C-alpha cells in the first residue's frame, strides 16, 4: 500500500466580481476531487461517480445544510479579519483540514487558515494550540484557545472521524484510488547546443502521480533538471529528468525510476 489523504478546502472572497462565488468548498481524496459546494449552487454535489453511487441522497441533503452554515460563518470570519487589518476592497480567506492514512497504519491530521493566500493560523492537535503569524492572528488564537471543548472536538475529528471518512471513501473508489497504471519510460538524446549532448528520461501514462526519477553514473548526478509531475487529462500523469554530458567524460550514465513499489533502470 501507499499513503492516502482526505482534504477539505474552503475559499471565501469579499466583494467578488459578477459570477465568481463569494464561497467555494471542495473535498479531495489524494489528487481526486470527491465533493463541491458554492454560494451560487448552494448545494453539496459529488465530483466523482463512486461518491455519487455509494452515498444516499440523505448525506448530500445533510451536508448541504452544514455547508450553508459554514458559508455564513466564513463570510463573518473574513469581514472581521478585514476590520482588524483595516482592509477595504476584495481579500481572500482559506481553510484546509485533513488526515493521511499511511501504509504502516499510522495517521496525521492538520487544520490551517490563510489570509490573502498566506499562512494565518496553524493548528497543533497534540499541544491543542494555534500558531499565529501576526498580532491579528494572535487575537483570534486567544478566543479559540479559551474554548477547551472546541479544541478537543477538533483533535477527535482529525484523529478518528476524518480517518473513518477516508477509509470509507477509499473503499467506495478502490478501483480508481488503489489501482496502478505503470509508467511507460524512454530516454531521448538531444544535442542542446552544437558539441553538447543532454539526456532526457521521460515517463507518462502513470498513476498514482508520485514517482522518483534520477540520473545516476557508474553515484547520484549533480545539475539534474526536473520537469513537474503533470496531469495528462485521462487520469494519468507524465514527468521527466534531464542531465548534460560533460564532454570527454564517456562515463556510464543511467536513469533510475521508482513508482508504486517497482524500480526500473534505463542505461544508455
Amino acid at each position, epitope marked *: 500500500m501507499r499513503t492516502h489523504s482526505l482534504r477539505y478546502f474552503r475559499l471565501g472572497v469579499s466583494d467578488p466580481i459578477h459570477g465568481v462565488p463569494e464561497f467555494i468548498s471542495v473535498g479531495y481524496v489524494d489528487s481526486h476531487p470527491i465533493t463541491t459546494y458554492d454560494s451560487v449552487t*448552494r448545494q453539496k454535489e459529488p465530483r466523482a461517480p463512486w461518491m455519487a453511487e455509494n452515498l444516499a441522497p440523505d*448525506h448530500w*441533503e*445533510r*451536508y448541504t*445544510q*452544514l455547508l*450553508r*452554515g459554514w*458559508q*455564513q*460563518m466564513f463570510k463573518v470570519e473574513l469581514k472581521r479579519l478585514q476590520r482588524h487589518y483595516n482592509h477595504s476592497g476584495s481579500h481572500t480567506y482559506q481553510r484546509m483540514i485533513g488526515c493521511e492514512l499511511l501504509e504502516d497504519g499510522s495517521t496525521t491530521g492538520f487544520l490551517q487558515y490563510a489570509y490573502d493566500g498566506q499562512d494565518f493560523l496553524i493548528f497543533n492537535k497534540d499541544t491543542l494550540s494555534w500558531l499565529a503569524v501576526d498580532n491579528v492572528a494572535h487575537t483570534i488564537k486567544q478566543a479559540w484557545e479559551a474554548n477547551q*471543548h*472546541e479544541l*478537543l*472536538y477538533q*483533535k*477527535n*475529528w482529525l484523529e*478518528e*472521524e476524518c480517518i*473513518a*471518512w477516508l477509509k470509507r471513501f477509499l473503499e467506495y473508489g478502490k478501483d480508481t484510488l488503489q489501482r496502478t497504471e505503470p509508467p511507460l519510460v524512454r530516454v531521448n538524446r538531444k544535442e542542446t547546443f552544437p558539441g553538447v549532448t543532454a539526456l532526457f528520461c521521460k515517463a507518462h501514462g502513470f498513476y498514482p502521480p508520485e514517482i522518483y526519477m534520477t540520473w545516476m553514473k557508474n553515484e547520484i548526478v549533480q545539475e539534474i533538471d526536473y520537469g513537474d509531475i503533470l496531469p495528462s487529462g485521462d487520469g494519468t500523469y507524465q514527468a521527466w529528468a534531464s542531465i548534460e554530458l560533460d564532454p570527454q567524460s564517456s562515463n556510464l550514465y543511467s536513469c533510475h525510476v521508482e513508482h508504486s513499489g517497482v524500480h526500473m533502470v534505463l542505461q544508455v
Partner: antibody
Amino acid sequence: QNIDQPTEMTATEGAIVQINCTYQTSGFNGLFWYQQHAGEAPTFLSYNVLDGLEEKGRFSSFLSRSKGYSYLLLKELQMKDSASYLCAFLDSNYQLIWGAGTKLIIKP
Amino acid sequence: NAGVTQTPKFQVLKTGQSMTLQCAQDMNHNYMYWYRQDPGMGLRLIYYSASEGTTDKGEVPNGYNVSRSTTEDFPLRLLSAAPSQTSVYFCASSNREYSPLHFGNGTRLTVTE
C-alpha cells in the same frame, strides 16, 4: 442507532449518585449532559469527546469510547440537584441523538 | 444577553386551529432548533436551521413548518392542531453544529376537540 439511560434514580442528600449513559453509533462528535428542572429549560452541564474524566465543582463527566459509555457523577447531593439529567451524543453527520432522560430524586 | 426568548409559555387550541410559536436569540447563533418533549422519550427534532436563509426537516416535521428570514427569529407554525400535537415545545440555539444548545423556556400546548 441507540442511547440508553435509566428512567429514575433516588439518592440521599449529601451522598453520591452515578448516572450512566450507553450509546451505539458508527461515528461520534462527542457526548453532552444537560440538566432539566421540572417546568424549566434543559441547560448545558458537560461535554466529553476524548476518553476520560472532566471535573467542575460537585459534578464529574466520564467517557469510555471503547465501551460506548458515559457517567455524570454528582457528589455532596443537595435537594436542588433534584432534576432530569439528559444524555445526548453527536453522530458523524452532527445529528444530536437524545436519551429519554434520568429523573434524579434526592431524599432529604 | 437574554439568550433564547420563546413565546407563549402556554396555549390551548381546538382541533384544526392554526398557531405560531415565536423564538428569538440575541447571541448571533447560526443554528436554531425546534424540539417536542413527550413523556418517556428523548427530545424529538421538529425542524432546524443552520443559518438565516435555510431550514430543514428534523425527525418529526409532519404537521409543522418553520422560516428563518433572520439570524434572530425561528418561528414554528402549527398548520392544523391535532391532539397528537399536545406536548411541550422547546426552541434552542447553538453557535455551531457541534456547540452547546441554549434553550427557551418552552411552550406547554394542549389540543382538545
